[PDB]
């Protein structure tokens, strides 16, 4: 899927979409390091000590959700997969709703993706986090409130954008979906629906190489 195709797809959902250069984001883009956690698109600050990891809705849940994997066993299998693929697997909560502090997982466990054909997780948020941690994953915990002003869809292979709690944004590493053999158009539609359903800004900036 091309940058123009992504923008066209988002606009079809009523979004504003702009394609931007990687140079315009110089000073913000960082190379991905395998020690970093593959974590959520959430724009808030947190207790993460493993920067440089890719961003996907709900952390590793984006992979389970895209593949329709709903069992705890399937979840542990994806955790190990991610860990064997050069990234530390993670899922998260926050200090306002504990494990329901991840907007993506909450939407998923409450069935907001029902109409898009997704099956529901066969576990609750605490059970999911225990399984990921048991499979060797990292449980992140965010702090503060959501103030994301824009969504960045980064297409630069092996690069990512980091959270800025004082000038928040949602970050989606579109190229990381490819890496995991996901249905990318499907993965991006789900990321857009997540922002939409969380009442976030339907304004995307697509970063291209
Ligand atoms: Zn989240």
TrEMBL record:
Zn(2+) 1 binds at residues 40, 92, 102. This is Cadmium-specific carbonic anhydrase. It comes from Thalassiosira weissflogii (Marine diatom). The chain holds residues 198 to 406 of 616 of the full protein.
């Amino acid at each position: 899927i091309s940058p123009a195709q992504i923008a066209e797809a988002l606009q079809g959902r009523g979004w504003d979409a702009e394609i931007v250069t990687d140079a315009s984001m110089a000073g913000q883009l960082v190379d991905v390091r395998p020690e970093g956690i593959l974590k959520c698109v959430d724009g808030r600050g947190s207790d993460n000590t493993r920067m440089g990891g890719p961003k996907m809705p709900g952390g590793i849940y984006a992979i389970a959700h895209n593949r329709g994997v709903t069992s705890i066993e399937g979840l542990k299998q994806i955790t190990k997969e991610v860990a064997s693929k050069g990234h530390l697997p993670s899922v998260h909560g926050d200090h306002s709703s504990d494990m329901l502090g991840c907007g993506f997982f909450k939407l998923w466990v409450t069935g907001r993706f029902d109409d898009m054909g997704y099956p529901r997780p066969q576990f609750d948020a605490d059970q999911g986090a225990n399984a990921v941690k048991d499979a060797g994953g990292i449980i992140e915990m965010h702090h503060g409130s959501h103030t994301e002003k824009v969504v960045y869809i980064n297409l630069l292979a092996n690069k990512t954008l980091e959270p800025n709690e004082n000038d928040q944004r949602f970050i989606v590493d579109g190229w990381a979906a490819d890496k995991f053999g996901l249905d990318v158009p499907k993965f991006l539609i789900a990321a857009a629906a997540t922002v939409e359903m969380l009442g976030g800004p339907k304004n995307a900036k697509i970063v291209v190489p």
